[PDB]
Amino acid sequence: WTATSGSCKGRCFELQEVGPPDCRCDNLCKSYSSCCHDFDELCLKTARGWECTKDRCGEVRNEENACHCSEDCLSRGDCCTNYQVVCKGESHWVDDDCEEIKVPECPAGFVRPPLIIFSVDGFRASYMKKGSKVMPNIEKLRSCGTHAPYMRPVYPTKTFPNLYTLATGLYPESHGIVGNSMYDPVFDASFHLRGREKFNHRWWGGQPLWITATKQGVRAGTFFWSVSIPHERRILTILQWLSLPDNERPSVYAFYSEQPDFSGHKYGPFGPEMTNPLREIDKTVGQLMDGLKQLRLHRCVNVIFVGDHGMEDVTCDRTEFLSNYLTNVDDITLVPGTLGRIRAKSINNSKYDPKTIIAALTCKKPDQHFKPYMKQHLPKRLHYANNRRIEDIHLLVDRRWHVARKPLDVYKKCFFQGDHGFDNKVNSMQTVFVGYGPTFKYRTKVPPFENIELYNVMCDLLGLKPAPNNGTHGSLNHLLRTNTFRPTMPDEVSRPNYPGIMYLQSEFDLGCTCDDKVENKLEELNKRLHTKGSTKERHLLYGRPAVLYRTSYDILYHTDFESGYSEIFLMPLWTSYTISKQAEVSSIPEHLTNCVRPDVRVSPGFSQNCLAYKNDKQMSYGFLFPPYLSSSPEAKYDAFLVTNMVPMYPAFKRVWAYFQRVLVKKYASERNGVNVISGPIFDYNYDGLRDTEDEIKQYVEGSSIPVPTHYYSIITSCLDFTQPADKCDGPLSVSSFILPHRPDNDESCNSSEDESKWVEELMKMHTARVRDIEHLTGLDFYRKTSRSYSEILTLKTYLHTYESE
Ligand SMILES: *[C@@H]1O[C@H](CO)[C@@H](O[C@@H]2O[C@H](CO)[C@@H](O[C@@H]3O[C@H](CO[C@H]4O[C@H](CO)[C@@H](O)[C@H](O[C@H]5O[C@H](CO)[C@@H](O)[C@H](O)[C@@H]5O[C@H]5O[C@H](CO)[C@@H](O)[C@H](O)[C@@H]5O)[C@@H]4O)[C@@H](O)[C@H](O[C@H]4O[C@H](CO)[C@@H](O)[C@H](O)[C@@H]4O[C@H]4O[C@H](CO)[C@@H](O)[C@H](O)[C@@H]4O)[C@@H]3O)[C@H](O)[C@H]2NC(C)=O)[C@H](O)[C@H]1NC(C)=O
Ligand SMILES: COc1ncccc1-c1cc(Cl)c(C)cc1OCc1n[nH]c(=O)n1C
Ligand SMILES: [Ca+2]
Ligand SMILES: [Cl-]
Ligand code: NA
Ligand code: NA
Numbered sequence: 001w002t003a004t005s006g007s008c009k010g011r012c013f014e015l016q017e018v019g020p021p022d023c024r025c026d027n028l029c030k031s032y033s034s035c036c037h038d039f040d041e042l043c044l045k046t047a048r049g050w051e052c053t054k055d056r057c058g059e060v061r062n063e064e065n066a067c068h069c070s071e072d073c074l075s076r077g078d079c080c081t082n083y084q085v086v087c088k089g090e091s092h093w094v095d096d097d098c099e100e101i102k103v104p105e106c107p108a109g110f111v112r113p114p115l116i117i118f119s120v121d122g123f124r125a126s127y128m129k130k131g132s133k134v135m136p137n138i139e140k141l142r143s144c145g146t147h148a149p150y151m152r153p154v155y156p157t158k159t160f161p162n163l164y165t166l167a168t169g170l171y172p173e174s175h176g177i178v179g180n181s182m183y184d185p186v187f188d189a190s191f192h193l194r195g196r197e198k199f200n201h202r203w204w205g206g207q208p209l210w211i212t213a214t215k216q217g218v219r220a221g222t223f224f225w226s227v228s229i230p231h232e233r234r235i236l237t238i239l240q241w242l243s244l245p246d247n248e249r250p251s252v253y254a255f256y257s258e259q260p261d262f263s264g265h266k267y268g269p270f271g272p273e274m275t276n277p278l279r280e281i282d283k284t285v286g287q288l289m290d291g292l293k294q295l296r297l298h299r300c301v302n303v304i305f306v307g308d309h310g311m312e313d314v315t316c317d318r319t320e321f322l323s324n325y326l327t328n329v330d331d332i333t334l335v336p337g338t339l340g341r342i343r344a345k346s347i348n349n350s351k352y353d354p355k356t357i358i359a360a361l362t363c364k365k366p367d368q369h370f371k372p373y374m375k376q377h378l379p380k381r382l383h384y385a386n387n388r389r390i391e392d393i394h395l396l397v398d399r400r401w402h403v404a405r406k407p408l409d410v411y412k413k414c415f416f417q418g419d420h421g422f423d424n425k426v427n428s429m430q431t432v433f434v435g436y437g438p439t440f441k442y443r444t445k446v447p448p449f450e451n452i453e454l455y456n457v458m459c460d461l462l463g464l465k466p467a468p469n470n471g472t473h474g475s476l477n478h479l480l481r482t483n484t485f486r487p488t489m490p491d492e493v494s495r496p497n498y499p500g501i502m503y504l505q506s507e508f509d510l511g512c513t514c515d516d517k518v519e520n521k522l523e524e525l526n527k528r529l530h531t532k533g534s535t536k537e538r539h540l541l542y543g544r545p546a547v548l549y550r551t552s553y554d555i556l557y558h559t560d561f562e563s564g565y566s567e568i569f570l571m572p573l574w575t576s577y578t579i580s581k582q583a584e585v586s587s588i589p590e591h592l593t594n595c596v597r598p599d600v601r602v603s604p605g606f607s608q609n610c611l612a613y614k615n616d617k618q619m620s621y622g623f624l625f626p627p628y629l630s631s632s633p634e635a636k637y638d639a640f641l642v643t644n645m646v647p648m649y650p651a652f653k654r655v656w657a658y659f660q661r662v663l664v665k666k667y668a669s670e671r672n673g674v675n676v677i678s679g680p681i682f683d684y685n686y687d688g689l690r691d692t693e694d695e696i697k698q699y700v701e702g703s704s705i706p707v708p709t710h711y712y713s714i715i716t717s718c719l720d721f722t723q724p725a726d727k728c729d730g731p732l733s734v735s736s737f738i739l740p741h742r743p744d745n746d747e748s749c750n751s752s753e754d755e756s757k758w759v760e761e762l763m764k765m766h767t768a769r770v771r772d773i774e775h776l777t778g779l780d781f782y783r784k785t786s787r788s789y790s791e792i793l794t795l796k797t798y799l800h801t802y803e804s805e
């Protein structure tokens, strides 16, 4: 109950929310049924519209009007935004030349440039070029300021997950808003876009920007606008707050538009009907910039123009139905549309079986337009698993499609022509970023980046210390003219051992054999130097990775490769090798087919053993440095060391062998040499972070050899591919992957074919950032380069997407 008969006189859009059952005059009151009786009359004035006209200039103040053209309006801070244009012969901001903003030019009393976040729903990245003729204000921001060709959203590419990621710097699995709809079984409560539970604070984790600012003594305006407040009134309210006294005035503000998303759903991303919502958004931008210019703030405020996600063509006839696959459709609940999430209709049914649901959905029709996953098997780049609100069973839906439970669900709800929510690497889901102001660079283009990075930068723009988040702070320093954050490299926690020859062959009883006793001063001194690190400058181009946790490991040098060997996990944590453009692929010789050789630098007690693999009928093994790429018949023996072996399901070895035998050489030819770092990942609790030894759920049968959940590779070369990877003077180029270590290839519907028709497709799906691998391994790469650390941070956040242009 709200005693809604107090008054909003003098309180309109008050910044603090007052205590119930007293009535509220803040923006949110509309959303909560809680506004005072006179809110509309006082706070949502509309008389005479939003623009000054020649006849209103100098008019007698009339407090009924939406905005004012009276002589006193500037000092009252409540002029219509085109006041100076219509009445004082001023130009619109969009008609002025741009001029570099080298320093903030702010009114007396401003302690820091304010930040205004102008957020637009469904603003697909290509609108910037395609709609440029109808968006002159936006185009001036973009061309004069700092812009990316696009910004990558988070998955699922829906409004609530993305805006709350913008606010917090966190992945949806960590902030808790994992979809536009949700069930939380600890709460036993549901979350819906329309409705009231969504306002309960227990949905919303992390620490959003407005809370970060408030805790650190910086005041914040409204971020969440009640839907029925018109855009013009949102703009005027921001401008009025900017005229408050210094002690009362917020330093951070947000505007939000539900367009162009609302129209895109109805008409498709490029429907002829889309031109008008883009003109209208541009007009709102012009209103803000004219308002800033009147307040003399237009060379003082930093403005961020940002989208939450794009928009794809999607119609009702592109709907797959679970009822075409499942006979038990009534025992399940599906969250439908551009992704699928499945759980049991009833937790009292112990015959509900996730395993047979998945199998019933897997490669069942020849052009099937979605793919089922246990959430832990989703591409690690999605970071979409470590939350009780994400259902164990997930469906990744093809772009342009929907999934629904039953046909009745689609027609008892064709209306829509657009939708979004798909995989965040899809081109149509990409959105926009422009930064304009004294703290941003002038006429500068930056490479695409992920929206999880913006929270750090907004904190930098406001002099705030960010709460812990998933951005990599410093990776966006190149956007900024000043206020950069000067990150330092994390310190190494464990230093390596450098073991020499310490064991005789007969001390090993690992059940391994190798046909290797096949018998010189020229090349006995030569191979001693190789074991000592003579070729390490070739194979370890960017320094050794730092180990950032406490552990016991050895560095092992070889002619063709260097590794960091873990005495705890009995395998390398990383293996580094460089393949030049000229390098040759050879085969594994016959007499060496099943060869595994004890490593006399490493004790039997810290080694894997072959018997375990023999005994384990499901588990085979592979090698981190591929024998196929050995530099000489004699160097090839190093590749069969027991210290280069890792456990691999036979199904996975099909993938790995193809990568090693074909793809590495292909990349080396195309990129002019590559450096490769490969290794295992253990993420049994699917949190995106390295497992400790006591978290491992699977071992090679009868042994202490832990089984990786994934295998990674980081492939680095020169960005200027006229220089070979091992002799690169300038910026680097990288691509990486984190391949799931699975006992079948059910994920790949064409796997019964030759690896050349499916393997590279699978690796592309599992593309990764170097940063994703760092989290999963506790390693820190690129420690010794000639590049600035900010540049290296940007390189480590790069994702190679395999989308076209
Ligand atoms: C992306 O960035 C984020 C932020 O940096 C990273 O997430 C952090 O990960 C840390 C490690 O996993 C984690 O640290 C833990 O904190 C626990 C205290 O947690 C509360 O307080 C924080 C801080 O204010 C708060 O943010 C948390 O909020 C979570 O919980 C509620 C749900 O109830 C949500 O509203 C909210 O959205 C958020 O949920 C998310 O995180 C939790 C994990 O905390 C997940 O379970 C959810 O699915 C969701 O994603 C909390 O309210 C603390 O309890 C932990 O301590 C244990 O582990 C330490 C190791 O130091 C051990 O020594 C201790 O003994 C302790 O173990 C004891 O408890 C165990 C579990 O009950 C028990 O098994 C043992 O036997 C012991 O008795 C731990 O330090 C931190 O909370 C999150 N922060 C956030 C915001 O998510 C994330 O890792 C990054 N991702 C990537 C890929 O890099
Ligand atoms: C789902 O976003 C939110 N949820 C809860 C708190 C705040 C935000 C939020 C956060 C940011 Cl960073 C921005 C830039 C806009 C936001 O909300 C805008 C909004 N107003 N009205 C409406 O419907 N939306 C989505
Ligand atoms: Ca883990
Ligand atoms: Cl959703
Ligand atoms: Na075996
Ligand atoms: Na298959």
Ligand SMILES: [Zn+2]
Residues within 6 Å of the ligand: 122, 159, 261, 262, 265, 420
């Ligand atoms: Zn939408």
